[PDB]
Symmetry: D3
Subunit: 118 residues, 6 copies
C-alpha cells in the first residue's frame, strides 16, 4: 500500500548551464506541482499509513521555502532543474518522513520528473 | 509488460470513526471519489487488447453501484472507510471477477490518494 | 469591464429531500464541491487589482468552514441543498462582506453545476 | 451576435508585485504557468464555417506571446505592476489592434485564480 | 438569473472540406469533443432546481448517440463540421426538446472551442 | 530518476476486429495523450538526464505521422488499439531514445495503457 499527496507552488527559477539563447536560461517561472509518495503498513485501528495532516505539517517548512520564491537563492537549488529539485525535496523531506518512497515534480502540466532515492 | 487502466468516479458520503475528537474527517462529509482499476497481462494477437473495457465495466458495475450515491459506512467492510481500507475493499470485491487486476487506486480528493497492489 | 474569479473546493455530504422515492440523489451521499466566486469592479490604479485574492479568501473563510467536511442538510437554509440553492445561499452569506460579488458558481461534479448572479 | 470562438495558450513566466505591503508573498520574486484565453466574437463565414482561422489567431498573437513566455514580466513596458488584471488589459491592448474581433482576454495565474477583461 | 450546465464528452472523427490543400484540419482526424449545455430559467421552489439533470440527459441522448463514436461529416448538417457549425447544429437539435437551453459550448481540444447562443 | 513528457494528438481510428455493431468498430476519433518516460543518470553539470527539447525533437517525426491523421493508414497500426499504439510508439522511439523506459497512451480522459518493452 502506497499513499500520495500533491502540492502546488508558484516559483521563479532560471537554468544557469544552458546556451545563451536557451529560453530556460532566462528568468522565468512555473506553477510547480510536487507529489510526495509514502509506502508502508496500514494500521488496523486508524486504517491509514499516516494522517495527511501530519504529512502536510512535516512538509510545510520545505513548502514555505519553495512557494512564492526564487529557487536559485535556495542552497542546493543553484541549478534548479526538475531532476535537481526532485532530489533536493527528497533530501529535505526523507529525514522527517521516513516512509517517503518517491518525489515527483512537475514543472508544467506536460513535463516532470520522478525520484526514488537511486 | 503491458498494463491497462480505466478510471471511474463516484459521489459518496463517509466519516472516519477512529480519528481524534476534533478531526474534520470525523464529521459526516463526502467526496467525488476516483477509482482506477489497473490490469496487467498479455495482449491477444487478434483483438489487440488485454480485455474489453466493456467486460471490465460490467464486472465492476455491481461494486460501483453499491459505492455511488451512497454512504460508505453502511457497507460491510467499510466501517472505517479511509482511502486505504476502500482500495483494499475494492480489490477484494473486484479481484475474484477480474483475475488480471494488478492495482486499485482511490483518490478522495484531486490531490490525495492511495494505491493498493494485493500486498 | 474587468472581472476577477477565485475557485475553492470543499468536501461535503448532502441528500436531496424532494426527489421521487428511488432517485439516487435522494440517498445520503456527497461531493467534492467546487465554488467559484466572481468579482466585478474597477481596477485600483495603485494596487493593480479589484481585490487581493488573499482578502477574498479571508472574507470567504467563515462560510467555507461551515461547508467543508460537513453535512449540508443540517445547515439552516440548506435543507434542500441542490447546486442552485447552495449557490444562492453562498451569495447571501458572502455578499455582505464582498459587495463587488457578481456571481457564484457551484459544481457538484466535474461535469455539472450552476451559476447564480443575484436575481 | 450568436457565436464566440476561444483559444487558450500557456506561458511560463516570473513576476513580482511592487505595490503590496512588505510581508506579502506576492511581493517576492516568483512565477506561474500563466494561461491566457483569447475570445473572438463575430459572424461565422458561410464558406469556411468559422469566425477566424486559429492559424491566423496564432500568428497575430505570436509576437506578444514570445515577449511573455519564459520572461520576467516586470521588465516589459506596461507590466511594471503585473497583476492578472494589468496583464489581461495589456494583452488586450497588444492584440486588439491586430485581431479586431477580439471580445475578451482571460488570464489565469493559477488553475484556481484569474480574471477576464472585455475592453 | 440562475443558469445550470451539464458537460458531455463524445469521441468522433471529422475533417474540414473547405480549408486549403495541405491544411492539417483538412485531413481525416478526430477529437475527444466536449459539449456543455447551458439552461437558464427559474428555480422551482419545491424541487430546488431548474430541471433534473436526468431529463436533460434523456433529452440529449438521441443527439449524443448520433455524435458519439461516429464520423461527423456523414451527418446531415455537419458536412463542414467546424466547432461553430457543430455548436449551432447541436443547438438546433436540442432547443426544440429543451426550451430553456440558453447556450451550447463545444470544445474540440482542451485549448479550443466556441459558444453558440441562438 | 525518471523524466517524462506528455504530448496530445488529434486522430481518427477504428477497430477492425470487434464484433458487429460495436461502437469502436465505427470510424471515430480521440484526443490521444502520450507520455514518454525516460530513465537514466542525471548529468552533474546540466542537472538533467536529457533536454526536454531533444526529446521533443526525437519524437517529432513520429508525432507528425500521428497527429491530425487516420491511424489505420499507418503501417503497424492496422489494429490501432491503445495497446498496439503504445507498443508501436515504443518501437519508433526506442531506437532514437535508448533511455526510453515506458510509453503511456491515453485514448480518453479515463482510459489508457502503459507499455514497458
Ligand atoms: Zn523553467
Ligand atoms: Zn473523507
Ligand atoms: Zn448530490
Ligand atoms: Zn504571482
Ligand atoms: Zn478537427
Ligand atoms: Zn477509439
Amino acid at each position: 500500500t502506497t499513499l500520495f499527496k500533491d502540492f502546488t507552488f508558484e516559483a521563479a527559477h532560471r537554468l544557469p548551464h544552458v546556451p545563451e539563447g536557451h529560453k530556460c536560461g532566462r528568468l522565468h517561472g512555473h506553477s510547480f506541482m510536487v507529489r510526495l509518495e509514502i509506502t508502508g503498513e496500514v494500521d488496523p485501528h486508524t486504517g491509514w499509513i499516516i494522517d495527511f495532516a501530519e504529512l502536510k505539517a512535516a512538509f510545510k517548512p520545505t513548502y514555505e521555502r519553495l512557494d512564492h520564491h526564487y529557487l536559485n537563492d535556495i542552497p542546493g537549488l543553484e541549478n534548479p532543474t526538475s531532476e535537481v529539485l526532485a532530489k533536493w525535496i527528497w533530501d529535505q523531506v526523507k529525514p522527517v518522513v521516513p516512509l517517503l518512497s518517491a518525489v515527483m515534480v512537475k514543472e508544467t502540466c506536460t513535463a516532470g520528473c520522478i525520484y526514488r532515492g537511486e
